[PDB]
Motif scaffolding. Structure first.
Motif, short mmCIF file in Angstrom:
data_model
loop_
_atom_site.label_atom_id
_atom_site.label_comp_id
_atom_site.label_asym_id
_atom_site.label_seq_id
_atom_site.Cartn_x
_atom_site.Cartn_y
_atom_site.Cartn_z
N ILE D 82 83.34 77.72 23.91
CA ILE D 82 82.70 78.20 22.68
C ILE D 82 83.69 78.17 21.53
N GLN D 98 78.55 85.44 17.97
CA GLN D 98 77.91 84.65 19.01
C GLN D 98 78.49 84.98 20.39
N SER D 101 77.18 88.29 21.52
CA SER D 101 75.82 88.06 22.00
C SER D 101 75.84 87.53 23.43
N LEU D 102 76.73 86.57 23.70
CA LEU D 102 76.85 86.03 25.06
C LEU D 102 77.30 87.12 26.04
#
Lengths: 51, 111, 111, 111, 97, 97
Positions: D82, D98, D101-102
């Motif tokens: 990522i 992000q 969130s993961l």
């Protein structure tokens, strides 16, 4: 130097049992594991860096 | 002419961009077969991440991986024949491409 | 324009060209990863040749392969919670990179 | 008149600023959710009280909690893929959002 | 040249607004206020557009809103972003209609 | 002398293009537009080639596509890159024909 030091640690660990087997049986074997498959052990090695 | 001429010159620009894109795809193919060989057949210590951390250009990384693969697979006699010398430290280039092709043939016949 | 200005301009130009070269190499590796994932995990009908024959851009091919891989490997709850929606048809981008990374590690743990 | 309609525009801009106040409130709600995540999944040593005693800004506390949560839940393979880098020490921002969130997805699937 | 580029962008924006106004006005008000016949009668384009907007307000926006929000019953001289408010209210009215 | 060599290369390229155009035009349009009779009527070689190209467009490319790409119904004055587009369109139409 870090990877080589880790290799040295594993080499010492193998060599202890190698010497113990040398004294108890008369012969000791240490396998040098490289980035290869289980069937590739039969093939010879020209130049490689052991795992 | 005039308006359409400049738009067709922009079309020539499109041709140039497509040529660049094809060149990038060729880079993809070459460098990617090299990276697949590197991962599949070489140690974790030669990973692009750790080599970049040690501070090497990516071209240096690829040539180092290629040289290691050639030493691992191609025999020393084949190196001394095709490359005319034993040492591969100064044989990066088209001769290196031939050597890595020979290494690919070697691994294919090994499997 | 003095000597220091000349040196800093030259260094900036060199660094910019080096960064552009690194970007080209990164695009090369991305093309590799798309090709290998499509060959290994996705059907022959999604090949770049047939998709280009149907008339889709290369980026469209990459994102379609990525979306198919995500649907194949990443579970629907994971999709609905990463991308905040079930549909992946409008999630191309960094979140698509996240979903494809999740699929990349999903196949690793599946193996 | 022109004065009436320009003052209408003025108060419409004030209305937009009111919406900015609302989105600030939403950000504060996200902050308290990250605080709950930190308490639920991280050590007592990373509490806001002790971090403030050590002298760190509130945003620094939130980003440290987020980075620790990403390392704890998100496996390092996703982390590397990522951020395009393994280290999270300079990945605070939208990519960090992000990643967290993961991490939320990871804990949801873990439960 | 980017100044002229942005000028052309603004030209496109007003052209799109005129397009929306025309596509609704032809189907809502009448054919007597068509652009061709108004030009033949001798009205500039801005005059035509503002007259069409005022007719749109007179058709959709009720007179009470005209005399309260715009403060005058006659839309003959109210033009501006107050006319913008009136045409927005007319858009809401035709949306709910 | 390599400048003249490349000039001769371009000469061969355009000669091959002219030969291909003439060979297809003879079998497709008519023999009234043959190179010999056109030269007798008094048209230069480039004028003959462009006239044959325009006739090829008018034959294979239907007039709707003509005005679509040429942007004008008459191919009489569209010559240039647009004309090359139109003749390639004629090649496409005869390929699919």
């Amino acid at each position: 130097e870090v990877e080589l030091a880790r290799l040295k640690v594993q080499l010492k660990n193998a060599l202890l049992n190698c010497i113990i087997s040398y004294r108890f049986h008369g012969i000791g074997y240490v396998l040098v594991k490289t980035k290869d498959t289980l069937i590739d052990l039969e093939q010879p090695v020209n130049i490689e860096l052991p795992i | 002419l005039s308006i359409n001429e400049r738009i067709t010159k922009e079309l020539a620009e499109v041709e140039e961009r497509e040529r660049i894109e094809k060149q990038l795809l060729l880079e993809a193919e070459r460098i990617n077969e090299i990276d697949t060989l590197a991962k599949a057949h070489l140690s974790n210590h030669f990973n692009k991440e750790v080599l970049l951390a040690k501070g090497y250009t990516l071209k240096d990384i690829m040539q180092a991986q290629r040289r290691e693969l050639v030493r691992k697979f191609v025999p020393i006699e084949q190196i001394k024949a095709i490359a005319k010398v034993s040492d591969i430290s100064h044989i990066d280039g088209e001769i290196l491409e031939q050597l890595v092709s020979l290494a690919k043939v070697n691994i294919k016949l090994r499997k």
